[PDB]
Amino acid sequence: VYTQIWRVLLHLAADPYPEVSDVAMKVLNSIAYK
Amino acid sequence: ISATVQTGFCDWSARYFAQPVMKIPEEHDLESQIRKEREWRFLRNSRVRRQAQQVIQKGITRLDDQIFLNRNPGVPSVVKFHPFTPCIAVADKDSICFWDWEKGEKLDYFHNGNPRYTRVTAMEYLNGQDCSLLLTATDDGAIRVWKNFADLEKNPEMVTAWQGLSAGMVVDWEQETGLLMSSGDVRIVRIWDTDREMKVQDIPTGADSCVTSLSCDSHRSLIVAGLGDGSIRVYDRRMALSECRVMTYREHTAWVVKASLQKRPDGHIVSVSVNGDVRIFDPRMPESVNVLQIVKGLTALDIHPQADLIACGSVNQFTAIYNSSGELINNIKYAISCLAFHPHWPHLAVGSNDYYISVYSVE
Amino acid sequence: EADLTDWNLPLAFMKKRHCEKIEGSKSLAQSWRMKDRMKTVSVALVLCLNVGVDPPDVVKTTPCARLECWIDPLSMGPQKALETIGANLQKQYENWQPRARYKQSLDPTVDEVKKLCTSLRRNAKEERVLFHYNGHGVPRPTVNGEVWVFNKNYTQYIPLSIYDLQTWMGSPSIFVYDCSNAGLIVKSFKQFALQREQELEVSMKNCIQLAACEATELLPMIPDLPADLFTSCLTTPIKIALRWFCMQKCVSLVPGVTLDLIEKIPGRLNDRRTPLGELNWIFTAITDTIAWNVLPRDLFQKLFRQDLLVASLFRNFLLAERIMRSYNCTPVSSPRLPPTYMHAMWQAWDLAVDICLSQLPTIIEEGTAFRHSPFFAEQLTAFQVWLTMGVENRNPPEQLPIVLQVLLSQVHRLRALDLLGRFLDLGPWAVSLALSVGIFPYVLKLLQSSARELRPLLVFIWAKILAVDSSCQADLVKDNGHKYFLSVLADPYMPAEHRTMTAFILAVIVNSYHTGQEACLQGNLIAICLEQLNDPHPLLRQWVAICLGRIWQNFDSARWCGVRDSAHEKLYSLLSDPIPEVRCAAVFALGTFVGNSAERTDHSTTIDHNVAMMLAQLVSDGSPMVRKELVVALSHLVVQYESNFCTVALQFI
């Protein structure tokens, strides 16, 4: 299940729309440092 | 815990109740300036349609006039003409140059935002009749729409953007239906509805090679799709997805440069592969009606629905603009990788390997 | 032509969500809330009547003015009359403030005044105390800031320093001077106030002062008017207002209206359906309207909104200013008011009086049923006419405080609530105005009504108000007004337009407020919401889902109730809704549901994984607006399983 949700976040991290990609990148970086 | 972000979505929704309700909206107001300016644009449209129709009735003369010659910084990949306002957007791999053909000036310069590997394959003009937009589908899948692209007091504005699919990418806008059909290397023809912002239909292509081109017919479901192996499938979206395919005729073996359909009720699929041989198909027939062979090594081609001019290109600087019957009109001597007619006026853009854009006119 | 094809074409990506930015409107600093509620705990009636004796300073005329508090002192004999006037004055004040400790002082000494004021100050040290002074029987106050009282034997006028008088009384107090050179007292009061302020280095704004006259002016000697002209105005406004009305030249326009008919006016001062109660109601509206239009907003809420009794005195003070002006008298107030005597609304008061007591010959003699005045009707008509061309931000409509007064009855309540809603429609600036005038506590009282006809109007009004000031969610839980709206959300016959506002109202009450979530949970909101979750209205589906998401925000008890009702399952249907507003709201609710697991039983974990995969099928979505909430939704999932997502993140490195 967690594998599936991380794969989703990869698409939102590489979003065409800038605001969504930015916020997704923050949330993805807030995982790394934990 | 500070990493917890909260969207303003629920708060933005609440603004709905701050605005007035009981009173008549601004659009319904018949005496509003927006409606008069919208009716004024539509008044200009009906004149431009009539004036262009009068040019068609006078026939098409030989086209050699050069209106202007400018130079771009990047390679012109795809060009489109706004139907009524003279705005000729000439995009590049990492930018979108907006030129003009009356003043003769660069109007704007975007950055698509896509990486270096990607490439802007297709382009459209959404809501061309009024308040036009600029769809910019990237080859990897990213589609995006730009507003205020050639305005004085306004800047670039990306309305929305979403990774489609997932040749490059192909699109066919359908103003009246409201749909949008992305396609490319995948074996699927999606149909993104823009009113519901959801993919309605995913038509299976049934073909190994990439969907190089894709054109449809207004008021009917006639999705034509050229392919890299050579075949040109046709799918009807009214029937079941398995049954969507109607005809599958194959009389080529090369990438289809431009499988273009005509806007007449007598639809004619003018497909030109890398081989350079034209084969005019029909939707109700299994084989071609006419056959022509023009150039051995074709690089880029353009056609016009209203006037049947097959604007060819050439490695040796030639620009053969013949009719569908095969008559000679012009052979303009200059990799001419982009030609583009107007939807109404007989203007033809041209673009060589060098980043130089021309716009011809029939006097 | 080829234009009808153009007009009939959908303009894609041209809607509120596209043109406008996705950002919340900044809430303004709502200062309408009252800072504090004062309570007039006790009242001091100092009466220097000196019944049967005439002050040496003023040589009274043979007729003079005998009536004092509507009592002839010489009729009853000296001692009884003095007691009677004190009793009546208490009753008169009890019309305005019935719950206060009254303590009369009748021709008091100096010690008597000291012990009286100090006792009432001891009772309410931090609360306002009223000091009423009637110096008609004592000589005029001196330039040196002194006021005259009697000696134990009633043989000598003893002077009393205003400084010492304001020593014994405390900080919260109000002073009423009814004497001839009363201005001198107000001047000397501010002097002793400044003198105390100078001593304070090495109680002015708190002290209110009313004065019948300017220091130069003298009191009127006219036999038609009562001697206690000022006090009567403050304490019996309607009584002198009708007697004064019958003295003006405008009586020619109404023949057959003498004072004797005014004496025998039927009704009471409470029953607004009677003729006398009509005038009191009209008078209260007109006076509160004049004040709101003329005074600055700060000083209006200070005097006319802080506490009732002060508001009543200043309301009646405006009438005193009008009447006394016609006798070369200028009343004086401590917070100086601009002159209102020539305001247009006074003419409306005349018409109201005219119509009200034109029926009195028929009511008294013929016994005709008193038809009510068209005044309040016509004022609502005026408010409606303003709204028609009220789009521009011009001067606000004068009649706003009248609409408030109309809400108190039922006869015109439907029409007023409608217009008030139409007014709120104009914009958010107007809702702010309506909160400053003080509409909130009256709209809240209507939530105790059961008349279902009121339900659609209150839903509308409350949506506009709660859109501006979301803090009122606290008040609605105290009064159990959330039940009133819960009923509306479970009424199929209620139109879906009003049901949408009702779902919004609930989504505001619940917003980030644990007390409201616990209260609505017990009111079974999640079950009610699911009953309307499949409505043919996309706005309702959106908000009902947001409301559902907010109620289970860091509140596991409402989550378990959702698990029993199986809401997460019923919400998956909205995940494929055409309208992207609903899709986005659906993603919001499912995220907040996951976010508050708080390490519950294994059941929660299996549900959270089921909710994940159901959300994980909203990736290929056109709107990034929806995709944005999809991230925020997955944020709630990561926070709950931070230990698990660290394992997955470290794997692919």
Curated annotation (Swiss-Prot), chain C:
UniProt function note: Component of the mechanistic target of rapamycin complex 1 (mTORC1), an evolutionarily conserved central nutrient sensor that stimulates anabolic reactions and macromolecule biosynthesis to promote cellular biomass generation and growth. In response to nutrients, growth factors or amino acids, mTORC1 is recruited to the lysosome membrane and promotes protein, lipid and nucleotide synthesis by phosphorylating several substrates, such as ribosomal protein S6 kinase (RPS6KB1 and RPS6KB2) and EIF4EBP1 (4E-BP1).
UniProt-annotated location(s): Lysosome membrane; Cytoplasm; Cytoplasmic granule
Residues with the Phosphoserine modification: 27, 105
GO terms under cellular component: cytoplasm; cytoplasmic stress granule; cytosol; dendrite; lysosomal membrane; lysosome; neuronal cell body; nucleoplasm
One of the GO biological process terms: positive regulation of pentose-phosphate shunt
Description of how the protein assembles with itself and partners: Part of the mechanistic target of rapamycin complex 1 (mTORC1) which contains MTOR, MLST8 and RPTOR. mTORC1 associates with AKT1S1/PRAS40, which inhibits its activity. mTORC1 associates with DEPTOR, which regulates its activity. mTORC1 binds to and is inhibited by FKBP12-rapamycin. Forms a complex with MTOR under both leucine-rich and -poor conditions. Interacts with (via TOS motifs) EIF4EBP1 and RPS6KB1; interaction is independent of its association with MTOR. (Microbial infection) Interacts with vaccinia virus protein F17; this interaction dysregulates mTOR.
Parent sequence residues shown: 18 to 686 of 1335
Organism: Homo sapiens
Family: Belongs to the WD repeat RAPTOR family.
Post-translational modification note: O-GlcNAcylated by OGT upon glucose sufficiency, promoting interaction with small GTPases Rag (RagA/RRAGA, RagB/RRAGB, RagC/RRAGC and/or RagD/RRAGD) and subsequent recruitment of mTORC1 to lysosomal membranes, leading to activation of the mTORC1 complex.
Tissue-wise expression: Highly expressed in skeletal muscle, and in a lesser extent in brain, lung, small intestine, kidney and placenta.
UniProt keyword terms in alphabetical order: Acetylation, Cytoplasm, Glycoprotein, Host-virus interaction, Isopeptide bond, Lysosome, Membrane, Phosphoprotein, Repeat, Ubl conjugation, WD repeat
Effect in UniProt of substituting residue 527 to F: In alphax3 mutant; abolished interaction with GTP-bound RRAGA and recruitment to lysosomes
Entry keyword annotation includes Flavoprotein: no
Origin superkingdom: Eukaryota
Protein name: Regulatory-associated protein of mTOR
GO molecular function: 14-3-3 protein binding; enzyme-substrate adaptor activity; protein kinase activator activity; protein kinase binding; protein serine/threonine kinase inhibitor activity; protein-containing complex binding; protein-macromolecule adaptor activity; small GTPase binding
